[PDB]
Amino acid sequence: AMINLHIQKDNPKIVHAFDGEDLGDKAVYCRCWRSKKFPFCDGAHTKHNEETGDNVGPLIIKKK
Amino acid sequence: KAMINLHIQKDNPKIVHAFDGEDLGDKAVYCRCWRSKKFPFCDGAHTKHNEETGDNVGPLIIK
Ligand code: FES
Numbered sequence A: 001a002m003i004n005l006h007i008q009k010d011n012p013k014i015v016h017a018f019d020g021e022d023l024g025d026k027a028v029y030c031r032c033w034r035s036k037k038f039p040f041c042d043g044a045h046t047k048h049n050e051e052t053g054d055n056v057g058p059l060i061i062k063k064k
Numbered sequence B: 001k002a003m004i005n006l007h008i009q010k011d012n013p014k015i016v017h018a019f020d021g022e023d024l025g026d027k028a029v030y031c032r033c034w035r036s037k038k039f040p041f042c043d044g045a046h047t048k049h050n051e052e053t054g055d056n057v058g059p060l061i062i063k
């Protein structure tokens, strides 16, 4: 089964690259491909996990 | 309906990773396909996933 169902389907391989210095105090990245704000997490993983029985969640890059 | 993660840390009810930006190296490549054997880091397993399913997923790079 496909993981990504609707995001940027004209792109054969979706990669995001960011400069660490350009991130704010807390960046929350989506790993479920259900966020309406992809590549950022909007909490869509909660709905995905509840509907499917999954346990996925985001990647957080924060300031010390 | 279909699960995204099939075999990683199933004893964890919600897999979240949190890193301090100052602690990251010159280039960190994070897995977004939940097929990497080095999760949360990308090991290129997305290539096999995309070919077998027709998907277009790939990693997150912090450089
Ligand atoms: S919305 Fe996808 S990991 Fe939170």
Ligand code: FES
Pocket: B030, B031, B032, B033, B034, B035, B036, B041, B042, B043, B044, B045, B046, B047, B057, B058, B059, B060
């Ligand atoms: S191994 Fe999963 S995105 Fe590369």
